[model samples]
Target: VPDATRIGRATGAKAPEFQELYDFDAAALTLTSAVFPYDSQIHRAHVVMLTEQGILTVEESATILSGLAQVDELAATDGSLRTYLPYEAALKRTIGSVAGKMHIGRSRNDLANAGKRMFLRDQLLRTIEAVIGYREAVVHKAADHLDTVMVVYTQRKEAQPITLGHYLMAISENLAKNLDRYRELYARINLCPLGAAATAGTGWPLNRDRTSALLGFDGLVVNSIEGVAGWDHVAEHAFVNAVFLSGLSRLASEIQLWSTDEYQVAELDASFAGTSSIMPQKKNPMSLERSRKAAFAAMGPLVGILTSLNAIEYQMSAARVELEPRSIDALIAATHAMTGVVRTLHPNKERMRQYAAENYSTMTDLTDMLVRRVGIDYREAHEIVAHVVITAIEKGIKANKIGLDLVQEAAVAQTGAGINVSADDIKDALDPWQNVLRREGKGMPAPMSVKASIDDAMAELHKDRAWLANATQALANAKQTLADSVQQIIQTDRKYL
Candidate 1:
């Protein structure tokens, strides 16, 4: 006994409207056409079967919605008309006689959890790809500009010189490390929860493993009751997303700093920029701002899930209410926002090169130069360079610009290193360009070193991205098997029990 009114009007002892919405057609049509269109398709074939079997009465199958209502203020009128059908008055027959308590194995409790897990599994994969894509962009940019020299800043002051590529590569390395963690978390999301029902399980025979495999899950929960009583998968995703957001926040912070007007170190693509309303000359870095904010948004889901978990009094509290169920909205929005911003970033190569040429901070190469070519103790050379560099600043001349005679006079009068060398060799040694070229080591910004690092980073991304694609496709194919079986199980009305 079920119809349209049975849905909104049913009380205890009557069919559960929410439950019927999951399996029966009377509930489907009533719920679908008005509030959820997809529900109508839930049992389309079953509806047809009922009609063909002549078990579907006109009143049950062809009830027309009729309602009118108007309310007006002051001198106006108000009226209303309504349509109603009782559960028993509109029940149909095709699935009526043989329906036979058809729910086979699991109750809605575990089935909903299982469905949720499947949803998270798919969405989490997409989020991982987005992270990879953003990191890949950083690696690609580093590969292209590794040798383009630029000043390095600490505490917002020019401290030393480094190639643009080296900076990008460092960022890429950090991002890749974070992404590797995400990949590990993603791989662990393959459990099925359907066998657990009503905190115990159905008393009927059920091949839970068969359903797990059919649904592309790695395995079923070991204990039927425990599965329905836990929300571990949801909690796991929330925590993992929080970690991802932290990494993303760091990346965005760097982007914002690099693009600032004061730094002008890198320029972002116009696609991500927005015109300032009052300032005609301003092209605001809206994309970066959005990317930065999205990291915060990603954390919102965790807050909600954790809040719900915290409110729970016992083991099955989550299954009972799911207080604030975590959904894909947060992850999807954050991932897309970040990926889009990264894809649109445009590093101003010329700007970087010019800035490097004008600023002496790229002089970190000086320590390397003294250590490599002059065989000076590195720390000693560093201190020496700092002294001479400061002197050069005071005298409005470069450190190596001083004549050797003047250097000796100054050295003997000051520190007594008594170093004797021509101004020209000193110039060559101290030149930022030569310094970068002479420096060689792992993770150094030397031209060759940076190139090698970029290549390796790209290779890593390529391999992982390739694997991700294959894994995603395999998951897709596996899901198709589940989709087909679910359709069959729903149609035949033959209980696995």
Candidate 2:
């Protein structure tokens, strides 16, 4: 736009504020609407790097030189390194050809990469923050529901009984690993991409290190082609976000099942429940439904990102146009949607407890009982219980509610282990709640065991939180110890070369 309207000569001696240059009628009228141009306006934060450095001076220099030189050729030179126009156009007029020569050592390729890495680093940090926030929610819920026992299912059938806290905590541990992976990946993303210019790097006595230090990047990506080709960083974000969303989908699927009256397992919080159009009494678990829908949207973006990445690969293989822009777009959209949906989840604790009690989910506790007071081998006890379970199923009754004498007699006949398999003994094992309370194995859901697990998790969470905070703070600073080499450009010059 500036180049198109270069017909102006702001008197050589006159130097006004930034507003005079950028907010002029010719550009503002066309670029912005009468109501508001805030959306199109340059975000102050985006210009922080260039403003702090002396890029404005370079713009002014380029403009003055281009304006004075061959009025026709000036367009090329005017937009050259163009630092002076942003600062001292009067000085640019005085230093015409010199301003034109600012390009002697720099290339747009390097500049583009520099700008890209800056934004990429910030986006990655935001994504990290989202994941951490979700983790915090998971941990909080796990602690609050430490004793809420629920069925552990395998192949869609109840396989065991475990506390709700343990189940949620297990997922949290997996998410913690995802968080750890992001930290390592973020390190790779923090590197400087400023030295790779025009696919061949610079020949000038370039102080890439000095600029890198100022920018606070980790290190330079040494190979020009690889630096330019590394669209994988964006893909990494897509993949990680997808994993998180996938986990959410899995969790939502279970929640959906548990919310059903048939399962009698749990209900969602009222705020997350919805009404059915045809049935006034239904309190549908809308949160889980929304979560599943959101997961699909998240998955869509990941698919797009992966597909775009393949094209980038094809482009690289054929030495054609670089294909990273679309992938970056896909990653941003997907990650933001994923974060938004996950951060709003609310667990229904009371419903979970009620369902746990009603569904006879504690049936597995019978095996523990047989092994405990009855002096029966677990295998034989298991067989006895299996028969009992079959009998109960056929008679449409609970195993524990059946006659104790019949259960005991059946157990002894089946096992022939000569253990104390009395009718009264069978009756004692009938209490599901009591059975669950006996959990004592290493990973069992006994209160003490669950507490130990939660305590360890809290410790790990504190560590992860600290690590994310430090890493994000470093990102906010726009450079870490690694950026010391590029410090000069980041500190003083906006030209990335």
Candidate 3:
């Protein structure tokens, strides 16, 4: 065997792609092969702070820092530095007992909480960006359809006339609220849970602020016990994802229905659609179907996490670390899928207008006219118009056909008086386009109102864009700071102070 060529595990014959049949690298089974940048940064920040506080000797800190850099070198190629034990073991492999000094005042309890927050905070920023991306798609699409008239529905029945813009801004507004939810969660989740060693924290003079700043946390969880134990912040993230995806699922369902033959109000572009081989006429909104399903899938994790932690008085249910990321990631996927569907969907202007013009959807406007012109109260006008609509239906008169004659008959039948009304008085009132046009009130469906809402939403989106960019850059800067701090300790005599 000593004389053989390519000795050791490489000498054996096996399938090339067979991954894990021995002679596998030892690092592969350890955290040395797991990529967890935030955990690494948390390690760097904790060690640096410990050194500055004299909890770790300068020489020991430097040796541990060198080990971490070696781990980083190994991590750069594969993965690693995921959990506390593998990281400390990886350190011990390089620097021996000196690496153990790196954990002087820290416990895995506080360290795990800190690393989890760092990880979750980063995930939240990504989720916020995804939400914004989807909101931008909806707002821009709404801008293009400020005048595309449509029938707005309630309980699946046509209730009023609206522009496609108003309907879409309504969605964008919800997305904007989701943005707020995420931003709030980001603020809460970015709090430092470091230095809260074990349940009550260490007696070491740990500067939690130093670690917090280096780790880019907004503040501290403060109470040491809660810092390591409280997990509502994590659950808040899951809950928000549930709310966010629930809203998305509703929109996805709407888009699904809008693209159907019965509605025909919108059509999915081929990119977002799939064809069925059996039917030949199926341009299914596959992306939206996935969006809806993803919403359900996203909700599953939230419930799972909540139940896992329900009445427990412990630090955190082990399931939290397993389930919370799944929830956040599910939402990210669902948001992107919904964005693709909304961005590529083609609203059928003709169908939208046609549907708006049918079904006496403009009757509400006529009732308004009755109140103004006949000097009648709203309830009286409503009753009169209600009678008018029933009569029109009985006579088979369409929305565009019925005139003042039918209105006067119903007016007299309902209110015992056939008040004077002219053809011109009711013509525009019966027009669906005019019906929407007449609604110039705040948040109304008129072009001007919808345009105003669109402008406001776009403005808020720009603000969110600024918010997300600043947030991302801050974290990146913090990451660089932590990395630089680690390298300085490893390569120079500079102390953290």
Estimate, for each residue in 348-367, the C-alpha lDDT of model 3 and write its tens digit.
Answer: 99988887887888888888
lDDT of 2 by residue, 314-366 (tens): 22232222223333333333333333333344445555555454344655566
Which should have the higher TM-score, number 1 or number 2?
1
Candidate with the greatest TM-score versus the true structure: 3
What would the per-residue lDDT of candidate 1 be over residues 449-489, giving only the tens digit for each residue?
A: 99888889878888878878986887777657644533443
TM-score of each: 0.71, 0.68, 0.88
lDDT of 2: 0.54
Enumerate clash totals for all models, in the order shown: 6, 34, 5
Distance from true position, residue 207, model 3, in Å?
1.4
**Model 2: residues >4 Å from true position, as ranges?**
1-108, 276-282, 301-360, 368-380, 412-419, 423-428, 479-497
